[PDB]
Amino acid sequence: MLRFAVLGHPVAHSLSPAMHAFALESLGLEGSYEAWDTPLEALPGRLKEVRRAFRGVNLTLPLKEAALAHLDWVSPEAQRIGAVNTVLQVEGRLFGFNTDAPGFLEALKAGGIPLKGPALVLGAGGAGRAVAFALREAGLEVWVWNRTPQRALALAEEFGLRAVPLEKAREARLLVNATRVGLEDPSASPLPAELFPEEGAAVDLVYRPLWTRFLREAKAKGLKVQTGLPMLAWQGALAFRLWTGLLPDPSGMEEAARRALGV
């Protein structure tokens, strides 16, 4: 039986177990995907356990950074981003990848949103780094903003981007919220409605609530919008493909995710 799991702390609310359960059944495969709470302290012992009993696992906070060292091989993309969210186990060896970047890209495409920059990424943290990398490689112009201006300038330098002031948002065609503003805060948004571009599209990686103020304002302003679920569904479907070579229907992955959310 294929044995999978998500390791992180917390993981009690991960939507991965539900999605992959659907992947397994939909693809007629026998196996399981379990949520396994793993504080940074247990990472070492947990991986050794992975080397011997799991075909693969996903990593969520707070393990994504300190995992690279314990692996036998890390993807170039995962090395630059500096985070690994998907681990593959073959012959007792552990290989690390980052399905968030490609998942994000495939989500937009599938969602119907033509890539068409310049693109602006709000937040220069973990989520921001991943998304910033992805859009560059796709062939779009990319700017970055962050609460604390420092973190922004550096990233623009490391990835070869532009750290712009929040105001510049008006000149972009692709807006991406990589901050926690809005998370379980229906009335909060990182971007003032007046600073919204006249045309384009916006994507929020925060999916709790599903329709954040950011996306509601963006929708009201005429921009095309996409919730955070599609990306979640694609990174998951891509991870599964990595593990077995079979791609579960991303739509079915998203639906499984929504049902789990109850929205």
Next chain:
Amino acid sequence: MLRFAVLGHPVAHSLSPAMHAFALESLGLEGSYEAWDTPLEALPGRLKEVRRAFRGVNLTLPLKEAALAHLDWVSPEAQRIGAVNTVLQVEGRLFGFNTDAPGFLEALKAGGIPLKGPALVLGAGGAGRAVAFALREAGLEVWVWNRTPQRALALAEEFGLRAVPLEKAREARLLVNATRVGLEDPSASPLPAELFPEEGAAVDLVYRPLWTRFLREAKAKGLKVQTGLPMLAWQGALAFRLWTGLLPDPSGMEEAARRALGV
């Protein structure tokens, strides 16, 4: 999803397509595995195509050794052996493994042939290196012979084994023909009949004909014998698990191979 192939020059009558067709089917999986003729000079281009459309491929003569330089990662064992018979493609990256070595040991085990040395491996070439590596790993005392003395001597120094003259076959308890002598030639055998021990076991990697002159001599001497089909099946099965995480029935694959030989 799941498109494999055996890359070699020649591969016209490979039994892999047959075994793997059975693997996929027996596992209720959709996919294909075809023989793709590939000369040495055509392999740089082949691997690029692999990265864009194949989940994985097996490599045969004369690509197994030249392949290493064109891969993103190569297993410690494959590196030591110096040859890759199994390649896995993930996110466009190529990883090389060797399922010949572990496959050989499983084959012996399943076939009811316990590890008892000294083990004499005939042929210090590629196939010989894989078998010698495996037997050393298993802790047996390993001897090696080669028509060209130098190659056997070099290999013995390299792996910490002992190069010996054919006459030492009389003291070996496990004999393995890893040479091409006898291939489609019922009159040829790498070991003169009078040098066969009178107890032990004999395995021939050559399976065309199935009952080589070598195996007929060993069987006539009362040695327990094994054809090359079991190893062929196991290296394929292990490769399949490498690619998908699922282990197809080795006996079923050997059977599929047999029926594909016309025997």
